[PDB]
């Protein structure tokens, strides 16, 4: 029973990236996955991906450009305050210089710096670096 | 409720210090004082033309509503002329960054002007100390059925 679709998506992404596969197949292909991936690409950590339709949830084919080292989800979407996000930084980001913990807020799925400069905090999704 | 001719017990039931005039050439059955609680609540129709007494009714009775307002789910209707509302909510224990679905059950008072089934969703309000269990009192039932407003299939 596929429970957290984005979790499986990024798990496959990370597996292939470690293996070196320049591309990945994601089965569920939900909105959350999609938005996570535009954040992924806009930060410059991934190339051009594609969506397939099935009349059932579609499919995802993401082109790996090697710049990724890991994705990663926080499947318990822990409830975070505006101040607390920084701690998540120091616990998931490889350094404060870069690295982006992705969180979903009322505004939407965003990078943590996007949220901070918007001064808005929602719930946590995952991380990229 | 009071079930079919309220005037049943060993004493009469009359809204206190309202005088039913025998000297009026009217034959108007009785004078039923009534009032709206407020806060955007609408007094239901069956209260104005009713015959019951319910001294503890917010509308036709003596009690005055003031203070807290809550929403809850009917859990038990067996008790006479009163009700019990379960309230399920989440509790953030700080040690684990988690919420906690626990329940608190509270008794309230229902006027005969209302029809209540188990599992109904009811807005309830605060009032005077009515009984050692009852300190709240119902206002109105929104989800009268939940999903059972349609039951037959005759196209």
């Amino acid at each position: 029973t596929r429970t957290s679709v984005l979790a499986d998506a990024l798990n496959a992404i990370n597996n292939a990236e470690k293996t070196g596969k320049r591309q990945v197949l994601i089965r569920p292909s939900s909105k959350v996955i999609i938005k996570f991936l535009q954040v992924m690409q806009k930060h410059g950590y991934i190339g051009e991906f594609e969506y397939i339709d099935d009349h059932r949830s579609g499919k995802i084919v993401v082109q790996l450009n090697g710049r990724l080292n890991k994705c990663g989800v926080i499947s318990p979407r822990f409830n975070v305050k505006i101040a607390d996000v920084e701690k998540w930084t120091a616990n998931l980001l490889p350094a404060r210089q870069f690295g982006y913990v992705i969180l979903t807020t009322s505004a939407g799925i965003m990078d943590h710096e996007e949220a901070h400069r918007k001064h808005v905090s929602g719930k946590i999704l995952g991380f990229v670096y | 409720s009071t079930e079919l001719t309220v005037q049943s017990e060993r004493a009469f039931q009359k809204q206190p210090h309202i005088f039913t005039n025998p000297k009026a050439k009217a034959n108007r059955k009785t004078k039923r004082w009534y009032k709206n609680v407020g806060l955007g609540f609408k007094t239901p129709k069956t209260a104005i033309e009713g015959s019951y007494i319910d001294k503890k009714c917010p509308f036709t009775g003596l009690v005055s509503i003031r203070g807290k307002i809550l929403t809850g789910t009917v859990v038990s209707t067996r008790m006479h002329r009163t009700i019990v509302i379960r309230r399920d909510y989440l509790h953030y224990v700080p040690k684990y960054n988690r919420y906690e679905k626990r329940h608190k059950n509270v008794p309230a008072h229902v006027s005969p002007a209302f029809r209540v089934q188990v599992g109904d969703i009811v807005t309830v309000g605060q009032c005077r100390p009515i009984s050692k269990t009852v300190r709240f009192n119902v206002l109105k039932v929104a989800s009268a059925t939940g999903k059972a407003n349609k039951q037959f299939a005759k196209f």
């Binding site: 029973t1 | 999903k147 059972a148 039951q151 299939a153 005759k154 196209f155």
Partner: protein
């Protein structure tokens, strides 16, 4: 590949094609298909049987793709849906067969194992069909209401 009542891990299934619209070659129209469907239903045939017959004896690939709607819902439209869905009904029938076996002979304790498994399936479907307002919630199931309804 969940397969509660065993360790099965088989994905053997059937995959619908892409076109929700009818194929080009087909000649019949929706209304005639509906009339064929309702006549088949009045024969006393369960909806899955009728779907199979439509697929085989005709170019009726999908009830929904051709007539815009599925079999059970159409059979509800003309007020002719049976009281129990074919699924639960067939499960109850198999349960009755198991029950008659176990009443005939006793030492089939492994058949008692199958009995508990199956009746668990009935309990699952009963909860589901009580939540979704198909059966009235008053309905229960022990042994004998099955004997009356099925037989």
């Amino acid at each position: 590949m969940g397969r509660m009542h065993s360790k099965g891990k088989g994905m053997s299934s059937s995959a619908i094609p892409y076109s929700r619209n009818a194929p080009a070659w087909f000649k019949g129209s929706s209304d005639g298909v509906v009339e064929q469907i309702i006549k088949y239903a009045r024969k006393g045939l369960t909806p899955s049987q009728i779907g199979v017959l439509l697929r085989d004896a005709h170019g009726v690939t999908q009830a929904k793709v051709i007539t815009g709607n599925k079999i059970l819902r159409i059979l509800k439209s003309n007020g002719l849906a049976p009281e129990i869905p074919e699924d639960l009904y067939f499960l109850i029938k198999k349960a009755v067969s198991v029950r008659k076996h176990l009443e005939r002979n006793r030492k089939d304790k492994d058949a008692k194992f199958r009995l508990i498994l199956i009746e668990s399936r009935i309990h699952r479907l009963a909860r589901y069909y009580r939540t979704v307002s198909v059966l009235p919630p008053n309905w229960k199931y022990e042994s004998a209401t099955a004997s009356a309804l099925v037989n």
